[PDB]
């Protein structure tokens, strides 16, 4: 049997089994031209999990690694707690215990990663921002069961999220969507779902928030801990609260199915006065070992 | 960091990635008293898979181990591929090459196994049949998009399948059910979904028949390799042949999700002239290393 070193990462979390798991196999000693689409496909399918990963040997002396990234259906160019949970193995994988950046290798192109004390962050490539008209509006306050405190809108930021602010943290939590009216009316608007956010007013850390992401189109009724969600949240919240200083974004996420995500967005005033939207999280290696590969 | 042994354990395969994978952990050195149920259904969710299971000490010298079996959702009493891939699990764990037989413990009882070169064996506990109305009969004949060569019926297996034959494995293999359809259907008839088959007519071996399992009301659009429905399959089958030998149905599942299952379903005609139902299958380990636990 062929086995090559596996690591299934628990993202966005220092405790396992609280975050977003990704598998990672570990292709840093094969060629990649032996491996087929198929295959790698297969894998993914297999594991059943959101994205399955995996590291090779990168084009250029210039990136660390290259990383490629699917879902049970297809791969991606890319997707933030893939490569999160994948920086964190690779430095494992490769006996790592010093960096503090590296440049992953993928479809998107090169995406710089920095670790700060275990803190794993790169920047988002996409985070636009599209309002959206009051009657989609209406009807959403209707399948949620809550009222807005402002107005949601649409943000693209890899899927199609809804945002929308509720009065604080609490009521986020607490929220009991009508699924099937989600699923309906996202189906109806080419959305993918949901995220709802309120902020937790009370607390020592300013801009706070309790998030949520729904997508039961997708047969995903509550995401867990959502990484795309929460640049959503923080490109959302620029646009409604228009920051004039870099500002972090504390979010926590998935105590409803019994997970505890922590996510980290900030959303970065740069140089020229524009903003970048970066994101960062623990990851915590849950399972180890080896798997068998053809 | 406790880390306990893990293995993912294809089952019905002895190639990796073609079977239907269970996370099996080893616990059997740390006493169950000391693991609330919270923690296990927490990893079951975690790990995402159609069941996780847990070694632990049996209570009693009489079985070699007992398992506890979880869904994402919860416990379950027993599952048959999850006993399957525990099995080959245990056996690796405690370094047995030589073990013909052994007997699980779990909330079922007594569930004596065999192990025959690779073949692992165990009598399913329930294979009930009754036959559905022939208004139920048509419907479903127009969500698969085929006639039926028998009358269906509804087999108690664990979950409520319909089981249905078409005219051969081919046509089988070709089907294109409407899911939402037959998700509607099921819905209201209170059933998991169809169970389809047809035999391999010019096969080498005897009463082979390809298989296909569609549960879309619980968002399984196809199970890929379906244990409790090969159960339901071979009970079926009883009823309609009236077999008087002890029969063996060969079955193979999952090629249009690109797997490829197989399934041995034993009609067994016992010195009572009664009959019992017998499941079995190859199983092996694909991923092997530890899993952090508290």
């Known amino acids: 049997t062929l086995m090559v070193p596996f690591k299934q990462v628990d993202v966005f979390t220092e405790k396992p089994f609280m975050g977003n798991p990704v598998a990672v196999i570990n292709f840093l000693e094969i060629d990649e031209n032996e491996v087929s689409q198929e295959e790698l496909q297969a894998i993914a399918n297999w594991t059943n999990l959101s994205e399955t990963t995996f590291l090779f040997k990168p084009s250029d002396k210039k990136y660390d690694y290259k990383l490629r990234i699917f879902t049970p259906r297809s791969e991606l160019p890319f997707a933030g707690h893939p490569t999160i949970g994948s920086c964190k193995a690779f ?19 090169a995406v710089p990663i920095t670790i700060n ?53 609490e009521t986020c939590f607490n929220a009991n969507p009508n699924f099937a009216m989600l699923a309906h009316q996202t189906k109806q608007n080419d959305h993918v779902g949901i995220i709802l956010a309120g902020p937790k007013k009370e607390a020592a850390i300013k801009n706070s928030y309790e998030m949520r992401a729904f997508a039961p189109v997708i047969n995903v009724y509550e995401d867990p801990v959502c990484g795309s969600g929460s640049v959503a949240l923080a490109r959302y919240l620029q646009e409604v609260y228009k920051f004039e200083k870099t500002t972090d974004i504390t979010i926590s996420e998935g105590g409803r199915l019994k997970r505890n995500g922590l996510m980290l967005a900030s959303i970065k005033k740069e140089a020229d006065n524009s903003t970048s939207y970066y994101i960062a999280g623990h990851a915590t290696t849950v399972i180890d070992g080896k798997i068998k590969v053809h």
């Open 91 to 109: 430095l494992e994988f490769t006996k790592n215990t010093t960096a503090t950046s590296l440049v992953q290798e993928c479809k998107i192109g």
């Open 117 to 169: 004390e275990g803190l794993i962050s790169f920047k988002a490539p996409m985070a636009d921002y599209e309002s959206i008209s009051s009657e989609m509006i209406a009807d959403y306050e209707k399948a949620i069961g809550l009222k807005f405190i402002k107005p949601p809108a649409l943000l693209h930021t890899g899927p199609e999220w809804i945002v929308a602010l509720v009065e604080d943290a």
